[PDB]
Structure formats: structure tokens, C-alpha cells
Amino acid sequence: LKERQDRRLGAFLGLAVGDALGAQVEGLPKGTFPEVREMKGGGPHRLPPGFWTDDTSQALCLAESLLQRGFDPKDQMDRYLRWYREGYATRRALERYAATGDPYAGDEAGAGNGPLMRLAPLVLAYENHPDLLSLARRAARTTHGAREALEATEVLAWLLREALRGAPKEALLALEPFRGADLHPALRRVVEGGFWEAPEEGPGYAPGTLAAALWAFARGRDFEEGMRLAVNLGGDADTVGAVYGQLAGAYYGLGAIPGRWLRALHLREEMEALALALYRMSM
Ligand SMILES: [Gd+3]
Ligand SMILES: [Gd+3]
Structure with a gap:
């Protein structure tokens, strides 16, 4: 069904849409700037409209790695490193690997949100793998090693898998499998309902980033509303937007993402092809 493919395309393109939109106001304190609603580009890097950043770049690298040779962390790092050296915590990890x-x-x-910002591709391709959460942890470990970042990635992997399978918003927010689980205290507070309160800003700390995405997902009635709530928190807006984009993308589907946002998105078609290839791979 196109309905099923729509969720996988939505999760992947949603990631890029959030990255591009949030990048426009990254670093700005909440409530100090005009509400972001359109792909105008800009931000500290004077990005052209629809242009994303490292968040999406890493997602693309991971996607190509998966399609090229299944789950191969060594190959993942070869690609990140190559991508890194072609341009001018993660950089330390790349040099450590080199x-x-x-x-x-x-x-x-490494307790940052890097593992979360690029996750979608892994779930699209290994959605049905019995060891999906373990694969997610390994995919996080390539650049981040803090307990809360690894666990936050496992939670996002679960969230994405369930969303792709049609789980309702209430079930996703309930995070039942993680209730009472032995998680880092910060992440436990998130899973137990810390996300119901609006963040003071878009956090760069993994648990906080996940909490901000969950909050926007919980309050937004559709993809667009939630995305605007997410990026307007300021702070690490491109990454909070990217994480929200993945979850909301998988939940609402590509058809629910504002068309003007997709038409302005850099490499839109390339990502749609990748998302479809990854989905085929999961079957
Ligand atoms: Gd970035
Ligand atoms: Gd950032």
C-alpha cells in the first residue's frame, strides 16, 4: 500500500524538513524571534531555503551504508569520516576511528543528540529485525557513548518502529515498554511524563532533545503545527526539529507534510528514492 510507503517516506523527509526549518533559528533563545512558519533559509549559516545540515547529511550517509552493505558500523564511520574531511564530540570520535x-x-x-538526529534510516531498513534496539545502540555508539544517549536512541527506535506500524499517538507517548525500566535518571524522568511540559529551549542533551520532540508531537494536532512548536523552542532547533520530523513523519505520513516545505527541500527526490529503497529492504 502507498499508505505504508507514505509513512517511511514521511519519516525520512520529515527529518530533513525539521533540520532545514530549525536551522533557520538555531542558537536563538525561545521567545526572542518571530515565529518560524516557512522555509526561508537563513540562520547563522545563511542557508538557502530548504537546505539542511549535518543532521540530514549523517542520515543520508547511514542510509547509503545500510543499502550498500547492511548493518556495518565500520562502513558507516568510513562515510562519516569521508563526509567530514570533504568539508571545512563527533569530530573527536571520527578522528579516534581514523x-x-x-x-x-x-x-x-558523548551525551549529545547526534545519534537521534540521524536514526530514521536504520528503522526504515531494520524495522522488523528482532534486535532493532541493539542495532540502534550500536549505531549510536559509533559517535556517542554516554548511557543516556544510547538509551535515548533505543527509545526513539522503538517510537519510530511503532509509529511506522500504525500505533496511535496515545500509545507512543505512553512508552509502556520503558515504564519502570532501568534507564538513566534523566531519561527515566522523560519516559515518566517529563515531556508533557514545554521545554525552556531546544536541548542539545539527548534526553532533553527527545523530550522536546515528544512534547511537540503531543501538542501538535498535525505535522505542521507540531513542527512549528518544535523549532520555535529555539536552541538546538535543527536537531529538535529533525527528531520531531522523524516521529511525526512516520506517524502522519509524507502526504501530511506541507507541500511547499517538500518542494523547497534540497535533494527531495534523492531522499524519497532512498526511503523507498530502505523500506523495500525491510521487507
Ligand atoms: Gd546541525
Ligand atoms: Gd544542532
Whole structure:
């Protein structure tokens, strides 16, 4: 069904849409700037409208790696490194890998949201794998090693899988499998309802990023409304937007994402092809 493909395309393109939109106001304190509603580009990097950042770049790298050779963390890092060296915590991980050959180069200080911003591709291709959560943890470990970042990635992997399978918003927010689970205290507070309150800003800390995305998803009645709530929190807006985009994209579907946002999106067609290829792979 196109209905099923629509969810996978939505999750992938939603990630990029959130990255591009949020990038326009990243670094700005909440409530100090005009409400973001359109793909105008700009931000600290004077981005053209619809242009995303490293969040989506890493997602693309992971997607190509998966389609090229299944789950291969070594290949993932080869691609990240190559992407990194072609341009001018993660950089430390990439250099660690370059020097030692260890693909799981993340350290305990890496509690950032990097693993969350690029996740979608993994779930699209390995949605039905019995070890999906373990694969997600390994995919996070390549650049981040903090307990809360690894667990936050597992929670997002579960969320995406369930959304792709048609689980209702209430079930996704209930996070039943994680209730009472032995998680890092910060993440436990999120799973137990910390996300119902509006964040003071878009957090860069993994648990906080997930909480901000869940909050926007909980309050937004559709993809667009939730996306605007997410990015207007300011702070790490491109990444909070990217995480929200993945969840909301999988939940609402590509057809629910504002057409003008998709038409302005850089490499829209390339991503749609990748998303479809990954989905075919999961079957
Ligand atoms: Gd960025
Ligand atoms: Gd950022």
C-alpha cells in the first residue's frame, strides 16, 4: 500500500524538513524571534531555503551504508569520516576511528543528540529485525557513548518502529515498554511524563532533545503545527526539529507534510528514492 510507503517516506523527509526549518533559528533563545512558519533559509549559516545540515547529511550517509552493505558500523564511520574531511564530540570520535580503526569510537562524554538526529534510516531498513534496539545502540555508539544517549536512541527506535506500524499517538507517548525500566535518571524522568511540559529551549542533551520532540508531537494536532512548536523552542532547533520530523513523519505520513516545505527541500527526490529503497529492504 502507498499508505505504508507514505509513512517511511514521511519519516525520512520529515527529518530533513525539521533540520532545514530549525536551522533557520538555531542558537536563538525561545521567545526572542518571530515565529518560524516557512522555509526561508537563513540562520547563522545563511542557508538557502530548504537546505539542511549535518543532521540530514549523517542520515543520508547511514542510509547509503545500510543499502550498500547492511548493518556495518565500520562502513558507516568510513562515510562519516569521508563526509567530514570533504568539508571545512563527533569530530573527536571520527578522528579516534581514523587513528585506531575502532568503529564504536564514542566516549562516555558523548551525551549529545547526534545519534537521534540521524536514526530514521536504520528503522526504515531494520524495522522488523528482532534486535532493532541493539542495532540502534550500536549505531549510536559509533559517535556517542554516554548511557543516556544510547538509551535515548533505543527509545526513539522503538517510537519510530511503532509509529511506522500504525500505533496511535496515545500509545507512543505512553512508552509502556520503558515504564519502570532501568534507564538513566534523566531519561527515566522523560519516559515518566517529563515531556508533557514545554521545554525552556531546544536541548542539545539527548534526553532533553527527545523530550522536546515528544512534547511537540503531543501538542501538535498535525505535522505542521507540531513542527512549528518544535523549532520555535529555539536552541538546538535543527536537531529538535529533525527528531520531531522523524516521529511525526512516520506517524502522519509524507502526504501530511506541507507541500511547499517538500518542494523547497534540497535533494527531495534523492531522499524519497532512498526511503523507498530502505523500506523495500525491510521487507
Ligand atoms: Gd546541525
Ligand atoms: Gd544542532
